[PDB]
Amino acid sequence: ARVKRGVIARARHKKILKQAKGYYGARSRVYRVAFQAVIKAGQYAYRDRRQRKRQFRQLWIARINAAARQNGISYSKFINGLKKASVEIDRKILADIAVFDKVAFTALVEKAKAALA
Amino acid sequence: METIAKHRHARSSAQKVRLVADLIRGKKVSQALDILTYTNKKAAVLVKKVLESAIANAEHNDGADIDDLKVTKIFVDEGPSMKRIMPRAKGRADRILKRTSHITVVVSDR
Amino acid sequence: VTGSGKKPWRQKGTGRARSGSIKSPIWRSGGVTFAARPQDHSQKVNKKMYRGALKSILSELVRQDRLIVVEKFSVEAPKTKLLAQKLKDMALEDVLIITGELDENLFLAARNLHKVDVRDATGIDPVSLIAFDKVVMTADAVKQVEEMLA
Amino acid sequence: MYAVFQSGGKQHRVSEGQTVRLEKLDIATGETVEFAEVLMIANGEEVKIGVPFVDGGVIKAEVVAHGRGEKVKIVKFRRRKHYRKQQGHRQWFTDVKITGISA
Amino acid sequence: MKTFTAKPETVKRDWYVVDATGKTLGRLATELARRLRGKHKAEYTPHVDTGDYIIVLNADKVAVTGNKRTDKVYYHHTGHIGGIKQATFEEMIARRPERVIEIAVKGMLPKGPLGRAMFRKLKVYAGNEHNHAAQQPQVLDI
Amino acid sequence: MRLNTLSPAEGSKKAGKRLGRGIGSGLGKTGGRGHKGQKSRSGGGVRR
Amino acid sequence: AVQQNKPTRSKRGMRRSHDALTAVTSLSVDKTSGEKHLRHHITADGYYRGRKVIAK
RNA sequence: CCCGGCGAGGGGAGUGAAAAAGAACCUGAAACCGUGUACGUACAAGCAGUGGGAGCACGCUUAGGCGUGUGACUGCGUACC
RNA sequence: GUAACGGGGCUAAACCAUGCACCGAAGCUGCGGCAGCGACGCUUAUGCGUUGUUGGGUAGGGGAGCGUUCUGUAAGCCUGCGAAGGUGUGCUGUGAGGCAUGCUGGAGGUAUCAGAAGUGCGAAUGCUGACAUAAGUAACGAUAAAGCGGGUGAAAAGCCC
């Protein structure tokens, strides 16, 4: 009962190497380095599912800041304003147009500054 | 339309053919044959007789004329290498590989 | 395997081969390691367990309606071609025929087909009874099988 | 036109013409989504509010796909200690298309 | 078909001339740096930056106004004996007024490559006299 | 035709497996056995 | 010195990029013969500015 | 029938079901060396990967940054045993 | 080579006194998906609803499945009306794996379900094969050297003369 071997594992190779295309050099054509690359890939990927959302959030706060200060007080008082004002959600994703033409929403910023009690 | 000339088991290595090959790369037949004869490397005579077969067999029975054809492909692959053991200082019994090339020229109208 | 008086390990203290005898299983041809083994792990079977499995399957062959028990399919002559026109007339083809009579005219007939087959009831076993589309037997075999099962 | 609303339990910024994916709904494909929990509309416009369930202001949408996702894999790993293990998950979703925004 | 996301197509620079006057070296310097990343107006995208093209034409001719000079004198390898040869803080003023202003905004930008992509948008020169302002940009006080 | 229809209860079957194989699976390091000494490295089938 | 890994095939292409030998351009005619030559140099078997050249 | 030196080696033409069967000829990975297209590389760098992406071909993206293949640029980030 | 804030920069943008804020983790939390199992309801051979702590994991214990070589139905059935083999992609499952399909391909293939094993390689300075690598880099065998016309020849400073 000889076994010839290397047909199931050959399919595991071709699956590793299929997922490892669009990668550089030996990663896209040799098993060993392909495997190495695949395990590092899916770990970074799974960091970045959550992590994109941390990184982006800075960019939402930094666009809102330049508007918010132009419409009165500065970002951290405005956010405490939104916390104090009733029937009103506090959030840091309220506007994408705090980037350019930042005179809009002045009335929401004055609602928070007044409400900052 | 298209014709292969090869020379297989030829006396070059591919490091030695590539110097000549990038000058004549996709470069039209007539201009490449002018550039080639002003290269006095051993590889450059080899590729000459092989370009001349490429152009000439096309003017019959697949086509006609020689001026209008272009060198669409120019390439080298590893032929079968002969291994020898070299006698050498201090009793060293090192490998020498006697490389050959398989040289392909392809011409077509293109 | 063609050496014991020769080690490929002969004062190792450099970067070298791990094998150290020329008959190793990790040699290209050397006699591999998990070899010369048995092809099943033990074989006996308890008598009550063997004889009681044959009772079980036998009840099921009646529960699947494979039995209708027909004695003597035999004719005047041992030719298959006569028996097979006999089996077509009884409307039971492709059947496991069990003889208890060892009649040469039946055993040497009904065999020229890939599913028409005749056997003797001797040295019964659980694997035989389950083969082929149905098992028809003769009443002579049913006596002679029942006493191996009881 | 740009807008913020509160749905499910997140707040989300969005434009007009936009196809977005959200947390699963009951609404089938080819039947209306409408959001009264819209927190403000802001497109060059001065506005008072941050208020939910506001009445006059709606974001109208539609379902464009209700599905289940293609198999993702998550790999859990620590070097040097011979630790490697793997799981899969899909998550169900709705895609909606924003064909709304009123103020 | 995706989530709302940012991209390099939505942000621009234009040209700004900073006529902010008589203003202290570092109090000039963090505001220019702030705008050379962009932050004073926005920052939206993770991969590129808001930015301005910045000419300084005013307030290029005052010292650090403190002690930073004497504990960070920017030594380099350049070949010596007995010691090491260095640039001095003192050299910088005598060979055009820019260099004091210049290593105040340089040092305010990130890493290697991004800090360089940002940096190449600043111009400063001799200051209050420099021809490299003929455009007449958007005027600005900070 | 009740042939190739055998199936018994759980725990009474090998189900085509041998162990000590893969470096992702968990069997890259030893399992069902220990480590170090003459107990589990080369052997153990010569200590009484 | 020795190395520390196997190098790249992108390197092999890079090191021979600035080495390969030059040529004159355009298929020549000559003032005194239908013979092609290397330009601004004696026609190898014919007339270029009177006389012929070469032996053996 | 073509090229060459008496040569080497290949094509065209014709054989055949097939020469993507041309003689090491079964179908044929992967190492192996080179061409051809698309897009890319000259303010430009590090486990070469992940997240974000101008742009270019093809998909009316339901143009609202998407599918597919690539990708100036860049946030983030230390191989496996 | 600053290099004892991580750096620019800050003679207040520091430090201290009173006090307030914000940003800041898969944490705490909401939306949506999902695993097994306690408690209670329906009430069961087979499960489901409410509710619930829960689901990072080596050493090491314990349980289950896959396919490869081969066996039984396979004695059947599918096959040049396009099989194995190669290759891209979609689908599917927790993973292995499985399944579909255009191109390729011109003879081979198959469950269910049980069962044997020379049973899957990426490591052993393991053994063997093809062949890559730094590199067109280094080496020019006592430096008994060479010249140049003709010729056998395709090709000649070095051969023959």
State the residue range of the domain holding B33: 1-110
Nearest CA among B107, B100, B37 for reference residue B74: B107
H-helix segments, E22-140: 25-37, 91-94, 98-105, 113-119
Chain B 12-71 contacts with nucleic strand H (CB below 7 A): 14, 18, 21-22, 25-26, 49-50, 52-53, 56-57, 60-62
Reported as type and span, the H/E element at residue D32 is strand D32-35
Cβ-based contacts of A55 with chain E (< 8 Å): 46
How far is C-alpha E112 from the geometric centre of its chain's CA atoms?
Answer: 15
Rounded CA-CA distance A20/B71 in Å is 35
Q: Which domain holds residue A91?
A: 1-117
What are residue A61's phi and psi, to 5 degrees? -65, -40
Residue with tokens 């591999």: C32
Give the Å distances, CA to CA, from E1 to C68, D18, D44: 70, 7, 25
| Domains in chain A, number | 1
CA distances from C71 to C61, C106, D80 (A): 18, 11, 76
The bridge status of strand C117-120 relative to strand C95-99 is parallel
Q: Computed from CA positions of residues G35, G37, G41, G42, in that sequence, does the dihedral angle turn out positive or negative? A: negative
The structure tokens listed for A102 are: 């930042």
Taking the Cβ of residue F6 and every Cβ of chain C, the question of whether any pair is shorter than 8 Å is answered with: no
* Consecutive H or E run containing D61: strand D59-68
CB neighbours of residue A96 within 10 Å: 22
Question: Quick check: A15 CB within 7 A of strand I?
Answer: yes
Helix (H) or strand (E) holding C52: helix C47-63
The residue type of B11 is: R
**Chains in touch with G (≥3 Cβ pairs < 8 A):** B
Nearest to B108 by CA among B77, B75, B46, B62: B62
H/E stretch holding D64? strand D59-68
User: Helices (DSSP H) in chain B: which residue ranges?
Assistant: 14-23, 29-37, 42-58
Parent domain of G7: 1-56
First-residue to last-residue Cα distance in chain D? 11
CB B71 within 8 A of CB B31: no
Note the strand H nucleotides within 7 A of protein beta carbons.
Answer: 1-4, 7-13, 24, 30-37, 43-55, 61-67, 69-77, 79-81
Measured from the Cβ of residue A17, the count of other Cβ atoms closer than 10 Å reads 18
Distance CA A98, CA A106 (A): 11
Q: Total domain count for chain B?
A: 1
Domain C1-149: which CATH number of 3.40.50.2300, 3.40.50.970, 3.40.47.10, 3.40.1370.10: 3.40.1370.10
Angstrom distance (rounded) from CA D33 to CA D64? 10
Give the method used: cryo-EM
Burial degree of D33 (CB within 10 A; 0-12, 13-18, 19+): buried
Which nucleotide C1' is nearest E73 CA? Answer: I2
- Across the interface, whether the CB atoms of A63 and E39 are under 8 A apart is answered no
Q: Which amino acid is at D50?
A: G
Distances (CA, A) of F47 to C1, F41, F44: 28, 13, 6
Q: How far is CA A101 from CA D44, E137, E141, in A?
A: 7, 20, 19
Buried b (16+ CB within 10 A) or exposed e, B89-101: eeeeeeeeeebbb
Residue identified by tokens 């305010």 is E108
F42 Cβ within 7 A of any nucleic strand I atom: no
Residues D50 and D5: beta-carbon distance below 8 Å: no
Between the alpha carbon of residue B29 and those of residues B60, B104, G23, the distances in Å are 17, 14, 15
Count other C-beta atoms under 10 Å from residue B20's C-beta. 25
What's the domain count of chain G?
1
Q: Do F1 and C57 touch (CB under 8 A)?
A: no
